[PDB]
């Protein structure tokens, strides 16, 4: 299933300002998280704003969203696990690996 090792999913991170604001918009309460929590809130964010395509729900559109500015892409496929993590890492600092 997941293309990301479980151990990496437990990496402790400190999101940068903009990403932090995005997570807090959906309930996030901390300054540091594990990647698993970052991915949880990010999912809630996309689900809530309905950024995914209705017909092909793995396609996410973000050209007119803060998420687009954060990922540097107009859209992406949820199926590209490694690519999503890579885009996420540029918006945070790794605390403990």
């Amino acid at each position: 299933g997941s293309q990301i090792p479980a151990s990496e999913q437990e990496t402790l991170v400190r999101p940068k300002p903009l990403l932090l604001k995005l997570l807090k918009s959906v309930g996030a309460q901390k300054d540091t998280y594990t990647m698993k929590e970052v991915l949880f809130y990010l999912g809630q964010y996309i689900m809530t704003k309905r950024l995914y395509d209705e017909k092909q729900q793995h396609i996410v559109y973000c050209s007119n969203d803060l998420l687009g500015d954060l990922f540097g892409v107009p859209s992406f496929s949820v199926k590209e696990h490694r690519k999503i993590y890579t885009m996420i890492y540029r918006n945070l600092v790794v605390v403990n690996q």
């Binding site: 990301i4 689900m47 999503i84």
Partner: peptide, 12 residues
């Protein structure tokens, strides 16, 4: 097929 189905696969 749903967004959450696909999204849930990223996490083990």
């Amino acid at each position: 097929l749903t967004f959450e189905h696909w999204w849930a696969q990223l996490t083990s």
